[PDB]
Write a protein that binds this ligand. Structure first.
Ligand SMILES: Nc1ncnc2c1ncn2[C@@H]1O[C@@H]2COP(=O)(O)O[C@@H]3[C@H](O)[C@@H](COP(=O)(O)O[C@H]2[C@H]1O)O[C@H]3n1ccc(=O)[nH]c1=O
Lengths: 173, 173
């Protein structure tokens, strides 16, 4: 069970606590319809993470990239952190724009269930996705780096509309 | 104990199995002293991972970067994977040149031990570092992506010379 726990702490230490302090400055640079101030992280509990989000939903299209963030990390000179800006559609209309991406460790949970050596049952994929979201929420609720700049979007599919799911959180702000 | 196990599986799923198939073609492009054909991964058991490798050792200097590897990953368009080429010195002489980097999850192990919320004891970071190397070694031995293109350098330091440690693995090949 500690797998999803460590991945959530990994996700915060080696990513969120590094890019969240510099995000609002990157969004301001791109603006100068404006882009929302927060980073919206998609958390599909089925751990189904497509690499191309524009084709995953017709009402979600890639718009542009943010200016890249670079830094020396673990002996890698100028390791690049890049983020994408997406437009959310509603009845053929641009309803909102924001920085949108999936939580990558959910891909790791999915692949571990496929591998036999990983000791990770296929049935345990849902509860680890749940534990990943609970641990990540606990971290961000007490995170100094998280100051109204990060919004988690967790959902479960059984019709469901992903673009309508993101627009709900976007309008709440 | 399952924390380091999941970080090692993450390290292979979301990184090693993505860049190792492309590494030899990237090293050849740079060559056209030649650079070695394997990715050399430093595994300090004390989990002390500096971000600037050149500062850590006077006999290890940064030389150049490889051509960047990009790809759409989890909704992030053109996510960048970059690797650095280092030169290793011995008595004021260039003794070797290779692609060298630390295993970043060891930084995650170090940071979890300092956070109280992580449920990770200070004393347990050497134990988790040993499990991370053991799990990663088991994966790469059975990894089809790893075909004698990856070399792990685990070491425990109480004098110790890191550049001398890397050269030993280089000269075996
Ligand atoms: N540019 C980015 N775009 C979107 N997400 C990012 C980015 N950077 C970090 N993250 C998240 O942060 C997590 C932990 O990052 P990390 O601590 O660096 O350790 C990585 C992990 O243990 C394992 C799997 O990778 P994942 O991507 O699945 O997990 C990371 C992302 O979830 O391979 C490690 N690894 C990956 C690549 C690299 O270049 N060197 C490196 O060492």
């Amino acid at each position: 069970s500690n797998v999803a726990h460590g991945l959530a702490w990994s996700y915060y230490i080696g990513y969120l606590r590094l890019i969240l302090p510099e995000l609002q400055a990157r969004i301001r640079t791109y603006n100068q319809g404006a882009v929302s101030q927060r980073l919206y992280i998609l958390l599909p509990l089925d751990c189904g993470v497509p690499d191309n989000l524009s084709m995953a939903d017709p009402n979600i299209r890639f718009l542009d990239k943010l200016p890249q963030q670079t830094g020396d990390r673990a002996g890698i000179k100028d390791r690049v952190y890049s983020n994408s800006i997406y437009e959310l559609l509603e009845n053929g209309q641009r309803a909102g724009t924001c920085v949108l991406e999936y939580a990558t460790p959910l891909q790791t949970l999915f692949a571990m269930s496929q591998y036999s050596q990983a000791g990770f049952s296929r049935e345990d994929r849902l509860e680890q996705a749940k534990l990943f979201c609970r641990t990540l929420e606990d971290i961000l609720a007490d995170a100094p780096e998280s100051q109204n700049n990060c919004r988690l979007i967790a959902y479960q599919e059984p019709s469901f509309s992903l673009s309508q799911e993101v627009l709900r959180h976007l309008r709440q702000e």
